[PDB]
Every structure is written in structure tokens, then in C-alpha cells.
Amino acid sequence: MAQGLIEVERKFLPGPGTEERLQELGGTLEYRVTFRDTYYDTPELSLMQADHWLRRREDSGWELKCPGAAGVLGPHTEYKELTAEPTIVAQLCKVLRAGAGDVAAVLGPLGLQEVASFVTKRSAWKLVLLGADEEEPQLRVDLDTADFGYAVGEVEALVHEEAEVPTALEKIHRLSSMLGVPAQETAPAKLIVYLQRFRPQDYQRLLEVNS
Numbered sequence: 571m572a573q574g575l576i577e578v579e580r581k582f583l584p585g586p587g588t589e590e591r592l593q594e595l596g597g598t599l600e601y602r603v604t605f606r607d608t609y610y611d612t613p614e615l616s617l618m619q620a621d622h623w624l625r626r627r628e629d630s631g632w633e634l635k636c637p638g639a640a641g642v643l644g645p646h647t648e649y650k651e652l653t654a655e656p657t658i659v660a661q662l663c664k665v666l667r668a669g670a671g672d673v674a675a676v677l678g679p680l681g682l683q684e685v686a687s688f689v690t691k692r693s694a695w696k697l698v699l700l701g702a703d704e705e706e707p708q709l710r711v712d713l714d715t716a717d718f719g720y721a722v723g724e725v726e727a728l729v730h731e732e733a734e735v736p737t738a739l740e741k742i743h744r745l746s747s748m749l750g751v752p753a754q755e756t757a758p759a760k761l762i763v764y765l766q767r768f769r770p771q772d773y774q775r776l777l778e779v780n781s
């Protein structure tokens with residue numbers, strides 16, 4: 571189970587020189603892929619309010635991201651990636667305060683409805699660091715373009731235990747600086763931009779309740 575359940579990440583807005591600097595560091599373009607995700611939430615965006623993200627990826631399956639360090643690390647920084655459907659069901663019941671063995675079965679009972687569906691084109695780069703001669707010596711950089719035109723990058727470390735997260739954060743920040751990402755720069759998740767575009771009243775309601 572070598573990869574790890576915990577995503578540590580930093581989103582950014584790509585520029586013309588991002589891939590070249592990745593290459594010059596020894597990074598490689600591992601693949602280019604296109605994937606369709608459908609996201610689910612209550613009409614109140616209860617999951618999004620709790621920094622939970624539930625999606626079913628075509629030809630891949632369900633995933634629930636939920637914060638690994640809620641209240642300690644800011645949103646869009648660390649997520650446990652839940653893919654075993656019984657764990658997803660348990661965590662959804664927990665967050666939403668509610669006999670489903672699979673996620674499809676729980677949507678009705680929990681009041682979860684489709685809130686977005688869209689396709690992303692991704693260039694997945696990986697950087698093996700120090701020729702692999704260190705702990706967790708691979709960082710991923712995804713360069714995504716959503717079908718609505720939004721371009722977003724993510725520098726990502728996948729680790730196994732919360733105790734690895736501080737070091738992962740440090741390495742992601744250092745790689746981010748080398749790719750030319752301003753320290754203060756933020757970039758919204760694709761789903762948030764989808765809501766801005768196509769469900770602007772939901773996006774406004776989200777801003778209001780999150781404050």
C-alpha cells in the first residue's frame with residue numbers, strides 16, 4: 571500500500587514557464603488524461619462547508635476527501651482520500667449527522683444531490699527528488715484545465731501518516747517557490763470555479779455561510 575491516503579497540497583495558477591522549470595528539475599510528464607467528475611452535496615452545501623468533497627469519477631469510482639487536520643491546517647491543504655465505499659458512507663453519516671453498504675445507496679437517505687459534473691484535462695508530472703535519496707522523494711504536479719476554461723495547478727505529496735505532513739508541507743512549499751509561485755498566491759478549486767460560473771447563487775450563498 572505504498573502510496574498513502576493523505577494528500578498534502580498547494581494549488582497555484584500556472585504560467586508559461588511552469589512545465590519547463592519542472593523539466594529542468596528532472597520532472598517528467600507521466601501522462602495526459604481526461605476525466606469526468608460528478609460532485610454531490612446537500613442543497614445547503616453542507617459538505618463543502620465542512621471542507622468535504624464527494625465525487626464519482628467516470629470509469630474510476632467514488633472518493634470522499636475530508637480534512638486530515640481540520641482546525642490545524644487551513645482548507646485546500648491536507649485531505650484524507652477515502653475510496654473504500656464503507657468508509658465514505660461512515661464519514662458522510664458522521665459529517666451530516668445521520669444501512670447503505672455503498673455510496674449510491676446513501677445519497678437519497680442523506681439528501682445528497684448532484685451539484686456539478688465536468689471534464690478536466692490533466693498533465694500529471696512527477697518529480698522524483700534527490701534521485702529518490704530521501705523520505706517520500708516523489709512530489710506530483712498536476713496541471714489541470716477544466717472544460718469551462720479554468721487552469722489550475724497542484725503541487726502534491728501523498729503520504730501515509732499525519733506525522734509526515736509537516737515535512738511534506740515544507741517540501742511542497744519549497745518546490746512551489748522554485749516553480750515561481752508567489753508565497754501569498756491562492757487558487758480556487760475547480761469545483762468552486764464551476765459554481766462561480768454555472769451556479770453563481772450557490773457560490774454566493776457559500777461565501778455568506780462560510781463567514
Ligand SMILES: [Cl-]
Ligand atoms: Cl487495498
Ligand SMILES: [Cl-]
Binds near residue numbers: 759
Ligand atoms: Cl481543483
